XYZ file of C-alpha atoms in Angstrom:
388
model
C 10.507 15.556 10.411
C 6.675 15.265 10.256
C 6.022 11.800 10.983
C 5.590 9.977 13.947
C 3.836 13.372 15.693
C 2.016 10.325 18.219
C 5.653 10.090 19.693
C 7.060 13.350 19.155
C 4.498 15.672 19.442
C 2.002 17.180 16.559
C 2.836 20.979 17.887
C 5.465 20.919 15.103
C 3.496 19.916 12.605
C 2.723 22.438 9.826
C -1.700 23.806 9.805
C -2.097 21.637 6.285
C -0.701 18.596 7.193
C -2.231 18.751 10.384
C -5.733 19.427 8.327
C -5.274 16.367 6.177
C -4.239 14.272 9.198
C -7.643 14.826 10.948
C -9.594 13.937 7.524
C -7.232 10.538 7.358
C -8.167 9.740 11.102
C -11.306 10.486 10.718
C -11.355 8.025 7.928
C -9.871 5.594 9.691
C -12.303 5.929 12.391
C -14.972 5.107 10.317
C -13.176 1.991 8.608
C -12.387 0.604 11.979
C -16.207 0.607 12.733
C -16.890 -1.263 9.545
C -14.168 -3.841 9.246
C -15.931 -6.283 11.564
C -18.615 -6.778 9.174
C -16.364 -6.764 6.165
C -13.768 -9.402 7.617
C -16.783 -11.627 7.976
C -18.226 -11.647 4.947
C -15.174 -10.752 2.717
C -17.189 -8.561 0.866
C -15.515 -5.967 -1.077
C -15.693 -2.489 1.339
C -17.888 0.011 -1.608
C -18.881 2.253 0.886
C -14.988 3.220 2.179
C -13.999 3.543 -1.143
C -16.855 6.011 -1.678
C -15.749 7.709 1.358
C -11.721 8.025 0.170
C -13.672 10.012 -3.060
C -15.708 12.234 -1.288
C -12.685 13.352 0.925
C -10.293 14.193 -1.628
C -8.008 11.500 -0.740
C -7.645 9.771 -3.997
C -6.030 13.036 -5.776
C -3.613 13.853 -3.058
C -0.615 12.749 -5.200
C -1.729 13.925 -8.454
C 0.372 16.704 -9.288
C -0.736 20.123 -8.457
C -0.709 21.431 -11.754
C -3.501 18.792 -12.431
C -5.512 19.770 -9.089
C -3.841 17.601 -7.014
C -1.957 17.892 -4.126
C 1.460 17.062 -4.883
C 2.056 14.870 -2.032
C 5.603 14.269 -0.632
C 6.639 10.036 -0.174
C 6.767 10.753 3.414
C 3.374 12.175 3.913
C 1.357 9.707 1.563
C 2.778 7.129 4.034
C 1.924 9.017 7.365
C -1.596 8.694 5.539
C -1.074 4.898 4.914
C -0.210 3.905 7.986
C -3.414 6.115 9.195
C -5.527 4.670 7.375
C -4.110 0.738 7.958
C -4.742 1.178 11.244
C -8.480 1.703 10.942
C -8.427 -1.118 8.501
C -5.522 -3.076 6.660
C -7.230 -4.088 3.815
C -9.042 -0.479 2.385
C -5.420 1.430 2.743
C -3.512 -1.389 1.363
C -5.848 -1.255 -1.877
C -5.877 2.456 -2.015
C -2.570 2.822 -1.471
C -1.728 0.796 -4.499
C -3.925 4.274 -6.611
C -2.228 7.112 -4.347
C 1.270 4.992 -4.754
C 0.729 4.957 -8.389
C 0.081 8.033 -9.449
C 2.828 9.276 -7.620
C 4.924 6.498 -9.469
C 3.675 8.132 -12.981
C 4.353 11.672 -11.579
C 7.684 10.523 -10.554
C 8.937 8.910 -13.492
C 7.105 10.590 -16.466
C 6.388 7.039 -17.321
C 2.972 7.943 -19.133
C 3.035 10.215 -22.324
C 2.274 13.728 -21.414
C -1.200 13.606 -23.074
C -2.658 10.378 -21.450
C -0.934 11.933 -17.786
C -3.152 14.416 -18.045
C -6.659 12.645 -19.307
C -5.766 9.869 -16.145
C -4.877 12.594 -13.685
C -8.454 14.897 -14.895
C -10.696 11.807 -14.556
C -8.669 11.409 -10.688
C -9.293 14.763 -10.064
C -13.130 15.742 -11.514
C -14.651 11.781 -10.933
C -12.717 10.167 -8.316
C -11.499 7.593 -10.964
C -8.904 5.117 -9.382
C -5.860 3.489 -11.237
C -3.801 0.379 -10.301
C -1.038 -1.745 -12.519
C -2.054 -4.989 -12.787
C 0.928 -6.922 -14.594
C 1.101 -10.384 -12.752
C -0.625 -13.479 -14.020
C -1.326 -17.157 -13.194
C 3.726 -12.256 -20.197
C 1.081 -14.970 -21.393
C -1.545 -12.020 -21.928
C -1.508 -10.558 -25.625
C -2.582 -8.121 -27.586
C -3.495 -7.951 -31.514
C -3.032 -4.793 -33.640
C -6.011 -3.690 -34.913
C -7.572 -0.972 -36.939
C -7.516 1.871 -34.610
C -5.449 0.285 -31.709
C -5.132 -3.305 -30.105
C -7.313 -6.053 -28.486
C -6.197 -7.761 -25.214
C -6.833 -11.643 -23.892
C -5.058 -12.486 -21.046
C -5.753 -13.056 -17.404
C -3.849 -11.193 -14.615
C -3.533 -11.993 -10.534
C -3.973 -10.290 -7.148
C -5.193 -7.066 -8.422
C -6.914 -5.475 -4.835
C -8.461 -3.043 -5.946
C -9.643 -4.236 -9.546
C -13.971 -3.899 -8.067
C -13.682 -0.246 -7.914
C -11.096 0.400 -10.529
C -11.568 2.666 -13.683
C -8.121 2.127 -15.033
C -6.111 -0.582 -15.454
C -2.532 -0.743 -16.729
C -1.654 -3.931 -17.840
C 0.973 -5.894 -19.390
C 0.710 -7.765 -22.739
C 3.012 -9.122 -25.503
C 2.351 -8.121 -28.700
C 1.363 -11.215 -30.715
C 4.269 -11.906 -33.783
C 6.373 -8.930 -32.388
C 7.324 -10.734 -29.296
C 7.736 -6.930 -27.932
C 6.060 -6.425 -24.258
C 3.886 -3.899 -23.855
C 1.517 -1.607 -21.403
C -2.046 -0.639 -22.142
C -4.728 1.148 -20.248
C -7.826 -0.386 -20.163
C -10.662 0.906 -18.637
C -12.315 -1.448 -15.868
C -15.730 -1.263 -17.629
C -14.294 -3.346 -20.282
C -13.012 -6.811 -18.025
C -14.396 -9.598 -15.940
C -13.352 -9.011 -12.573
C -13.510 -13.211 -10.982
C -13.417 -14.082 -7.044
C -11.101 -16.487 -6.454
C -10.131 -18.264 -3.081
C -10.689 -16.447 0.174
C -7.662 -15.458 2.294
C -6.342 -16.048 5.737
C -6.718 -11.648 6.114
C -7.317 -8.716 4.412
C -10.273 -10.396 3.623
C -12.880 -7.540 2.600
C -10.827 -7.030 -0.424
C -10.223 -10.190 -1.063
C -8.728 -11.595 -4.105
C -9.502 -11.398 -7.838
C -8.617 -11.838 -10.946
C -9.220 -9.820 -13.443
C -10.349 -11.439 -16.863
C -9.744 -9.940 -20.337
C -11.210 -11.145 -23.209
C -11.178 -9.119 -26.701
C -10.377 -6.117 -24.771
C -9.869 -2.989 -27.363
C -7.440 -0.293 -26.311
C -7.263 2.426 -28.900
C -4.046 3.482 -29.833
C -4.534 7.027 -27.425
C -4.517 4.736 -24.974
C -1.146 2.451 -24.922
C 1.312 3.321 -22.262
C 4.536 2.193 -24.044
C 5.697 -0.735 -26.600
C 8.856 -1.811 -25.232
C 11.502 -2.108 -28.435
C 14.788 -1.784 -28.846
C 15.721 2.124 -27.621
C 12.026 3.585 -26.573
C 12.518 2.273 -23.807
C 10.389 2.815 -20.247
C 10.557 5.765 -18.288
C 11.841 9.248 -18.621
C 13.674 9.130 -15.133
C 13.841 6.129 -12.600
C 12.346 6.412 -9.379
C 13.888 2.558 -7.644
C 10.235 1.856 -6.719
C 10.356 3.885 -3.920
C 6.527 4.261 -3.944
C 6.217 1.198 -3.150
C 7.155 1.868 0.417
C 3.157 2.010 0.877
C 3.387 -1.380 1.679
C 5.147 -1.649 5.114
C 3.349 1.937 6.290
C 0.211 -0.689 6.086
C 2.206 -3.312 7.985
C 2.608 -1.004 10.554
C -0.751 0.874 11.005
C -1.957 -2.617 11.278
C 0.973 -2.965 14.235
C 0.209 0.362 15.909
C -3.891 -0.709 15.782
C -2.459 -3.962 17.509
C -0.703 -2.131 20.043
C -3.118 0.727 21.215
C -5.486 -2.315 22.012
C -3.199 -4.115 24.184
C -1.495 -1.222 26.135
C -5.728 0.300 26.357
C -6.742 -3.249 27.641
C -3.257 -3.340 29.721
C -3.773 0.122 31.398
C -7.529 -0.860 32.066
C -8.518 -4.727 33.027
C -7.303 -5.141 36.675
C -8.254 -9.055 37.406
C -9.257 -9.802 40.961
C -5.851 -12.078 41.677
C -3.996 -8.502 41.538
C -4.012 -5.283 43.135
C -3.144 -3.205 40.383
C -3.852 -3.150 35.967
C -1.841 -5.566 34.218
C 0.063 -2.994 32.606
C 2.444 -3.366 36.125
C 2.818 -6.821 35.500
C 6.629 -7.091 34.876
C 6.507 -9.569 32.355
C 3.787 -7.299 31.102
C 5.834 -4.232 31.361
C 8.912 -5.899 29.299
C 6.349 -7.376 26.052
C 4.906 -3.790 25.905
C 8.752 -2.001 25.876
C 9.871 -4.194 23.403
C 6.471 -3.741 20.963
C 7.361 -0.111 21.115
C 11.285 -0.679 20.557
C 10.925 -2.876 17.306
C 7.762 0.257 15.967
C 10.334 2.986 16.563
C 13.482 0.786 14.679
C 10.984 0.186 11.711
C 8.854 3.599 11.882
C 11.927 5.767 12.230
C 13.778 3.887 9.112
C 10.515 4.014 7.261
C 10.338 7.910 7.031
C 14.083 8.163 7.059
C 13.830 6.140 3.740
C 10.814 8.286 2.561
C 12.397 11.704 3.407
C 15.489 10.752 1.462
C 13.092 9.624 -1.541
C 11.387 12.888 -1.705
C 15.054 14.508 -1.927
C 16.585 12.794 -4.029
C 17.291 12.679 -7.674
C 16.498 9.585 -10.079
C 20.152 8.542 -9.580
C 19.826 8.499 -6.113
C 16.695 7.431 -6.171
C 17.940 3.978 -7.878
C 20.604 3.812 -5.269
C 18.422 3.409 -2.659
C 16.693 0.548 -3.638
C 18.642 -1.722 -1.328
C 17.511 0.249 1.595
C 13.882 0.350 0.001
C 13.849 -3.767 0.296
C 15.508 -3.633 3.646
C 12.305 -1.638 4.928
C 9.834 -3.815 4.225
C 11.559 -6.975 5.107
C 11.969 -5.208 8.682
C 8.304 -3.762 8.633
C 6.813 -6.645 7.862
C 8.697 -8.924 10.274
C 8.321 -6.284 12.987
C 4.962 -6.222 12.398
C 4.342 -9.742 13.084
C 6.014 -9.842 15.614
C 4.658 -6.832 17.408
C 0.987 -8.788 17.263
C 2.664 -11.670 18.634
C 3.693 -9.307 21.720
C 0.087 -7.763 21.886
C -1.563 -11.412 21.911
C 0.678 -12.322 24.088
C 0.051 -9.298 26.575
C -3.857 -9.410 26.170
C -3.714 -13.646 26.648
C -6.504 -15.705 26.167
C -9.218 -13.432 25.202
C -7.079 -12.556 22.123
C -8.332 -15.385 20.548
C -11.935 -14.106 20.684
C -13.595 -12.512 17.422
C -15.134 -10.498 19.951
C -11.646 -8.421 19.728
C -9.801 -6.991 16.635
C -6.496 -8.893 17.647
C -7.364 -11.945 15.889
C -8.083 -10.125 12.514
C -4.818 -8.054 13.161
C -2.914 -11.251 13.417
C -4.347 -12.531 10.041
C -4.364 -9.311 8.133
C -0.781 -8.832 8.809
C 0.550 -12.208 7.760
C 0.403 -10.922 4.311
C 3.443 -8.702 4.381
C 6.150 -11.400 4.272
C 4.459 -12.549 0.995
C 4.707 -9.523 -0.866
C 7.594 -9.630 -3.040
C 10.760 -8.855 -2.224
C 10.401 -12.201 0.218
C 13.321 -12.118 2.634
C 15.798 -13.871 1.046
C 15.768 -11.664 -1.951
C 16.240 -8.293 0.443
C 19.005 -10.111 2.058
C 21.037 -10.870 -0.861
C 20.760 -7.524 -2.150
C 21.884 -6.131 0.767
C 25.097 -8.214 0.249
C 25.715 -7.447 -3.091
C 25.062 -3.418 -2.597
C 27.553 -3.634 0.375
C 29.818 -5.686 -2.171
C 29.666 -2.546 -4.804
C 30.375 0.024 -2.077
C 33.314 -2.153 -0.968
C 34.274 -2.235 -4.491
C 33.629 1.614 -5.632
C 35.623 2.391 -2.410
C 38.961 1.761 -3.990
């Protein structure tokens, strides 16, 4: 409907969206310059971050009411995959704070109150928010007077150096009840860990909590029998942030290779590569396997934004298929651009090389493979079986 304007034309595209689509390529622009830099040293990117603030980016989802922008799925990842393309690390990390809040807005997950304190520090400070519930749940909290204090230790949290919030998971010690508690960054250790084969400016980190208090103002939810999560299910679909990466990190890979195709005419030939036929057929096929996984992508967003929290469930299936075929397409559509470019793609003196490392990360993310597979099976199992 709106997306994928580079193939069908941005004419159609309504005056906002087409305003907020110059600030996100504009963005890009600038992370693209930087990523060089960043990739080398793996040091954390600051300065982009800064950037997202100053732009408004980082409040895009919050919910109008709260001086946001309401966001639809669909457009957040238009934005994504923007954004990826100038670099995959910064959009993957930000997207986890734009795909959150609209998560929260979504799902009324957060009482009313503490919405709206999160959502005004978003808004008036450019305060960013991630969940952070994974760990090497081992981390607890204590009641206390006033609230509760939190040791644990939690894993792969990408944007943890320029957090303010955290939402993290904890058991409750001698209620063996789970819980979630917002934390403010201020209060944790954030520790490097071991570098990565990509997305190496954010790199990795834990973050470290020892004697952390959260006043009681500030606990998400204490999950006993009949509270019990969320006032309306959403099936994750937010998390489709993660293959609109993928791909901007595929389309970046392939505007290099068809620009270098169109443009480096060896002396052996009388004409650019791109009219080599073997040439010809790697550069059809990168853009067959992006339209397949960009058109299902949006398809899958569009019906999000539609639906109802029934629905919404319903389509989690479809939600796992996406990513398993953005991610793989992905891969595979760097392969094709290595492959077209040849040798020289090897060089550091060209982005392929960080392309083809940055996107190996996708078919880590959970849900591997396997797992979308299966649940494909067993949703085409329950339609066979409602059928009747």
């Amino acid at each position: 409907s709106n997306a994928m304007y580079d193939i069908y034309g941005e004419a159609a595209l309504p005056a906002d969206v087409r305003e907020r689509l110059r600030i996100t390529r504009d963005l890009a622009q600038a992370f693209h310059e930087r990523a060089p830099e960043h990739d080398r040293a793996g040091d954390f990117p600051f300065e982009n971050i800064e950037d997202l603030k100053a732009s408004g980016y980082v409040r895009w989802t919050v919910p109008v009411e709260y001086g946001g922008l309401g966001l639809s799925l669909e457009e957040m990842l238009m934005h994504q995959e923007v954004l990826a393309k100038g670099d995959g690390s910064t959009a993957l990390a930000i997207g986890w704070h734009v795909g959150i809040l609209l998560h929260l807005r979504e799902t009324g997950a957060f009482p009313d109150e503490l919405f709206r304190m999160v959502c005004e520090s978003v808004v008036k400070e450019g305060a960013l928010i991630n969940s952070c519930a994974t760990e090497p749940p081992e981390t607890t909290a204590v009641k206390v007077p006033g609230g509760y204090r939190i040791t644990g230790r939690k894993t792969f949290s990408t944007l943890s150096p320029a957090l303010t919030w955290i939402m993290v998971t904890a058991t409750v010690a001698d209620e063996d009840v789970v819980g979630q508690f917002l934390v403010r960054k201020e209060d944790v250790e954030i520790v490097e860990t071991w570098d990565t084969l990509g997305m190496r400016a954010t790199g990795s980190h834990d973050i470290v909590l020892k004697d952390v208090f959260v006043p009681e103002e500030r606990v998400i939810v204490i999950q006993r029998p009949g509270v019990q999560a969320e006032r309306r299910p959403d099936g994750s679909g937010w998390l489709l942030h993660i293959p609109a990466c993928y791909l901007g990190i595929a389309l970046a890979a392939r505007d290099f290779a068809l620009e270098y195709a169109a443009t480096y005419r060896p002396n052996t030939l009388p004409h650019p590569i791109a009219e080599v036929p073997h040439v010809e057929q790697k550069l059809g096929e990168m853009e067959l396997k992006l339209l397949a996984a960009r058109t299902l992508l949006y398809d899958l967003a569009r019906r999000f934004d539609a639906a109802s929290p029934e629905e919404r469930v319903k389509l989690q299936p479809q939600f796992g298929a996406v990513k398993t075929l953005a991610t793989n397409a992905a891969n595979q559509v760097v392969d094709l651009a290595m492959r077209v470019v040849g040798g020289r793609s090897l060089s550091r003196a060209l982005p392929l090389e960080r392309y083809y490392r940055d996107v190996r990360a996708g078919l880590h993310n959970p849900p591997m493979d396997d797992v979308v597979y299966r649940n494909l099976a067993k949703a085409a199992l329950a339609r066979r079986a409602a059928g009747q």
